Design a protein around this ligand. Structure first.
Ligand SMILES: CC[C@H](CO)Nc1nc(NCc2ccccc2)c2ncn(C(C)C)c2n1
Lengths: 292, 149
């Protein structure tokens, strides 16, 4: 813009370029998301307008804060708070070795931000480390709402082509057209496991089939009794029955019994069985903690 | 009166009543402009299915009732405004991540379209969420749309 001095390029987002900038009047450091409006990449403004609409209504310390939107030229500039790094880069800086208390802090803050979105009827649908911003304060912020949507209005279906593959729940992998807040709860469980280990994705599948196998191989294959509507989903196919007796101990070594119990509650295959963000924050894993 | 065609007619009849200066506007004109966009997006492969559903028409009406001035001076202007509201409904409620600008743009001035987009979001972002989060508000808007016939 003309109110802002560009200091450097942070990277590319889902629909624009991200810069670190300084407000020439208040001297505050901000982040700018710039979006070209004279496209040859035709649909990009659409996701930006959606992000603006949602973030205007999502004001919470653990959700990245949109301050302003400027329209100045052939571009839309969104002005956000600046954050120092994303969780993916943070994993590289600390050799994927988080202290257990930072593991707890990051999950807690993620669940607070996600709880706030869910209670305001918004699904994020792109929960992954790169969409989590970290401050030197140690504050964590949910960012990048370009794939997010409001929910509640009667709808035929939602898109099943949501969430990066590694973070997508089994029901959506089986092609579920209707999902709730549960979709983001699975992804948060996936992140929890990265935090509580060595910062590598728990389920790095190469495609939908591989992804489902990875999940079932660790967690066990759900039975009809645990998940009666599983066989009725649009892209259901029979999987092998892997036992539910596989230990999580070595998969998340930073976690105690209480931590492993919360993880298993997030990583339920049946979305109806998945713990809500509100209930996860009441979990004994967070009972002796800092903020409240 | 929960059919898509019926509600679209209700919206067309509402727009004719709202825009009193437009003496030669047919209530079928808005219906035609909306259907054309949805059909073109389908045929050109931007979407798998049509966006114009009963609930999305209620959503669009909720935007139009607050955004569209009684003082609109031309049919062309109405179309530009309505298509702005439609494009924001696609961006907010649609199942694809992006929709292109071309079917929605009827003005020579692109920058007036983006300015109107931001002005509408500034006015409506709260209600756009509320109509999802509050089923009684949705029902009230759907009832109002019906009573426009
Ligand atoms: C573009 C890549 C990076 C992905 O997290 N995005 C990013 N990264 C941000 N900060 C982390 C970072 C800073 C510098 C280099 C690399 C990462 C950041 N701060 C505010 N915002 C948005 C919400 C405008 C930020 N966006």
């Amino acid at each position: 813009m003309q109110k802002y001095e560009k200091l450097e390029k942070i990277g590319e987002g889902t629909y624009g370029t991200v810069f670190k900038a300084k407000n020439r009047e208040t001297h505050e450091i901000v982040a700018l998301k710039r979006v070209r409006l004279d496209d040859d990449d035709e649909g990009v403004p659409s996701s930006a307008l959606r992000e603006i609409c949602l973030l205007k209504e999502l004001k919470h310390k653990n959700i990245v804060r949109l301050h302003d939107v400027l329209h100045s030229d052939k571009k839309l500039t969104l002005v956000f708070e600046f954050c120092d790094q994303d969780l993916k880069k943070y994993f590289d800086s600390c050799n994927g070795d988080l202290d257990p208390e930072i593991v707890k802090s990051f999950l807690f803050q993620l669940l607070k931000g996600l709880g706030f979105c869910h209670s305001r009827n918004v699904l994020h649908r792109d929960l992954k480390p790169q969409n989590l911003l970290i401050n030197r304060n140690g504050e964590l912020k949910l960012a990048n709402f370009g794939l997010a949507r409001a929910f509640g209005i009667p709808v035929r279906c939602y898109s099943a082509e949501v969430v990066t593959l590694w973070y997508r729940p089994p029901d959506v992998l089986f092609g579920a057209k209707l999902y709730s807040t549960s979709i983001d709860m699975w992804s948060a469980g996936c992140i929890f496991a990265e935090l509580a280990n060595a910062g590598r994705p728990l389920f790095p599948g190469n495609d939908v089939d591989d992804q489902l196998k990875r999940i079932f191989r660790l967690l066990g294959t759900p039975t009809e009794e645990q998940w009666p509507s599983m066989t009725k989903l649009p892209d259901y196919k029979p999987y092998p029955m892997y036992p539910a007796t596989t230990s999580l101990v070595n998969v998340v070594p930073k976690l105690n019994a209480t931590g492993r119990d919360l993880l298993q509650n997030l990583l339920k295959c049946n979305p109806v069985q998945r713990i809500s963000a509100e209930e996860a924050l009441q979990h004994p894993y967070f009972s002796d903690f800092c903020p409240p | 009166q929960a059919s898509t065609s019926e509600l679209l007619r209700c919206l067309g009849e509402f727009l004719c009543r709202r825009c009193y200066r437009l003496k030669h506007l047919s209530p079928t004109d808005p219906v035609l402009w909306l259907r054309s966009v949805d059909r073109s997006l389908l045929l050109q492969g931007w979407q798998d299915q049509g966006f114009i559903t009963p609930a999305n028409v209620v959503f669009l009406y909720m935007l139009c009732r607050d955004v569209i001035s009684s003082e609109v001076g031309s049919d062309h202007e109405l179309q530009a405004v309505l298509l702005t509201c439609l494009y924001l409904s696609y961006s907010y409620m649609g199942n694809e991540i992006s929709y292109p600008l071309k079917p929605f743009l009827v003005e020579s001035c692109k920058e007036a379209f983006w300015d109107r987009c931001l002005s509408v979001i500034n006015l409506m972002s709260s209600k756009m969420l509320q109509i999802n989060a509050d089923p009684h508000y949705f029902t009230q808007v759907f009832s109002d749309l019906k009573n426009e016939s």
